[PDB]
Design a binder for this molecule. Sequence first.
Ligand SMILES: Cc1ncc(COP(=O)(O)O)c(CNc2csc(C(=O)O)c2)c1O
Ligand SMILES: Cc1ncc(COP(=O)(O)O)c(CNc2csc(C(=O)O)c2)c1O
Lengths: 385, 385
Amino acid sequence: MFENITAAPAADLFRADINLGIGVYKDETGKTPVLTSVKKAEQYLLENETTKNYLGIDGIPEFGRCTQELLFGKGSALINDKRARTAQTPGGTGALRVAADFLAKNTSVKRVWVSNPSWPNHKSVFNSAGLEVREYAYYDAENHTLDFDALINSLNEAQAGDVVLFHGCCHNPTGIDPTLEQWQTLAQLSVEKGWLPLFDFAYQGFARGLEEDAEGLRAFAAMHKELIVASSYSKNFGLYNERVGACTLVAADSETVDRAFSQMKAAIRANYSNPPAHGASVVATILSNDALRAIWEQELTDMRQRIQRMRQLFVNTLQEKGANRDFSFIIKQNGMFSFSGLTKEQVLRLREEFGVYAVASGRVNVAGMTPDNMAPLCEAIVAVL
Amino acid sequence: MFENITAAPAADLFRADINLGIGVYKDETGKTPVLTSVKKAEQYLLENETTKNYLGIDGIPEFGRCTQELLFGKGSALINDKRARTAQTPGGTGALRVAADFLAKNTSVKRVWVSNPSWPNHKSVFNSAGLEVREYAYYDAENHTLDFDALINSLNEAQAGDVVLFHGCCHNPTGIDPTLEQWQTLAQLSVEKGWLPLFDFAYQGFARGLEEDAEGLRAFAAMHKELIVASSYSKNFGLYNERVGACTLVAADSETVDRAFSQMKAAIRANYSNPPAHGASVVATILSNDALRAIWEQELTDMRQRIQRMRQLFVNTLQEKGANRDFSFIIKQNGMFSFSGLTKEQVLRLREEFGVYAVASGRVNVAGMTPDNMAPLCEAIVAVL
Ligand SMILES: Cc1ncc(COP(=O)(O)O)c(CNc2csc(C(=O)O)c2)c1O
Ligand SMILES: Cc1ncc(COP(=O)(O)O)c(CNc2csc(C(=O)O)c2)c1O
């Protein structure tokens, strides 16, 4: 049965002997520690859990409520009108796959529109569910900005009933997000064209703040009867390996969302049955407790701010090491990732001659940068320019 | 998009006011506590974990090794010859779905054969991956035994390249397992007919013991170049909600299994990306530590033995409450579940008139029974005979 299977298309080189191709947050010491708020919650769970009995298919109710509040805001009409249902999922990826399976099996959706560039796993996830993936223009490589007019031009090829995927904030890989006015334009256009918006929200809190980072989503939510949000707590709780995310379904009213959500639960049941408790329980414990939530929000703020300091230090140090070229785009971009503007061959050179690792696209993880490694990193970059 | 979705086909009645329709183990007090070995491991993890950085797609290496040893035996040729690869998954269900996606995308498999009766989610899982499910005869409702000759008759309709699903031990819902000689007959037949065996192993340790319960699988593994095992640690570690299972792929040699496994990892990547650490880390911590493993094995033994005591007490008490009918089949059956022999209407009557809850099939969870609830439970049953 297996003798003729083709190998899947093919960090290790890094280990064999700076990592900017890392996918996680690192602190100033180059570590990805467990957040203190998380350790405190885990201790509370160790002390207080009396069973590991299965969660419901949609997971921990408190987790769902706290998630909806994060996405839509306390007192949101969507919440008040019971228009949203949330399934706790194994990570943002799990939420995306649940969304994809739900859509493939229960709707006429055949196509999902994703930005060029995006996270490479988007295509894999949607294709796995039998959905075609189409790309829309996004990046202006000259101004290192949102190629907006072009985005709109690309998207006028999208038919009514197509899904359009939006990164909520901290676009991956570019760090370039729509302004609020641009989000508002997109929200209006989406209504007019009959797109189903799918928000991928893996970095809430890493751009400007929890509430600010949700402005775009909330602009869409104000305009649409229906949408889906696939969110992740992997980076903003440092809970990567615990697989903590959420798939939130929004419909016109409670009757419609509940009915549709029944099929989302069926899609989950046939996949992993019900979701893993530990990571989501830590999130629910933290979000629903004033003291823990305060510690967590500050920890998230510390991460956001350290990234901003590295963006500034990167730009300053490149200038000091004798790059005579603008990198101001780095300061204005949001989240852990930016395109450095380096070519695939410069990136290869960086790895081979200097041991500095980025992805071929030239995307770098700014959280891989520290006050200590910045000078050598920038010296290397200047050398390949 | 969602306005026309049909609701999915539809515990609560129990709550509204004995539960034998429960899906988990309960102790003599009616609780499903966290195992002591698990609490000890969780404390060790709280004390020692310094990051939540993502696991590899296939999860914790130690978890994989310990799993293979449990399934195949220490010193197994399959292990020695590196013929098996294991992905840590979100539960047995997750392992089944990973198997199904892997098979649908990378092989000519179109059909999976499942026993009639089985766990109802088997059909959902395979169908979700685009695979047809066919049933084979299993249960002799007169002798409350394995309708074996009939099983074989059913399965001669299976074509070469079809998958045949076997419950490793503690068949769900019947508690009726092949004898070793029957497993050996099935293993030979499977080779001759060109079936791909898929073992579903959710109850290792609940029939006779860890090693004994794996005899059937090992009989197949001795005969086959290729097979898949979907295992779960939900019931034998009491880790239900942490989602701890494994998909183990076996091929003729290391080159072939590694190549095939690359596509299994691709299937995981496009689903939930990588698996949840907490539950699998507890399993790995326990299995790889002599002291914790000893405590755990005894806890598992205590569960196995309590179930056996309830099977015996059930049969004795039914006789004492004036059932003049054999129930000896209960003593010989394996695991938490048996068919009581009650009809769907008797089961309905039990619920409505006596507040005793089973599934319509008449399947009862023997671990729902206690010395305290046995007399009323048996009085109720006698009343509906
Ligand atoms: C846009 C977007 N969508 C989905 C995901 C999946 O997040 P988790 O499944 O890890 O929660 C992520 C985060 N997953 C991820 C891990 S490393 C990485 C990268 O781009 O390096 C990405 C994301 O950035
Ligand atoms: C034969 C078989 N296959 C797969 C599974 C899935 O186990 P987990 O996904 O819970 O680990 C299980 C256990 N899942 C389960 C939870 S309640 C239940 C039942 O039959 O009541 C079954 C099983 O018995």
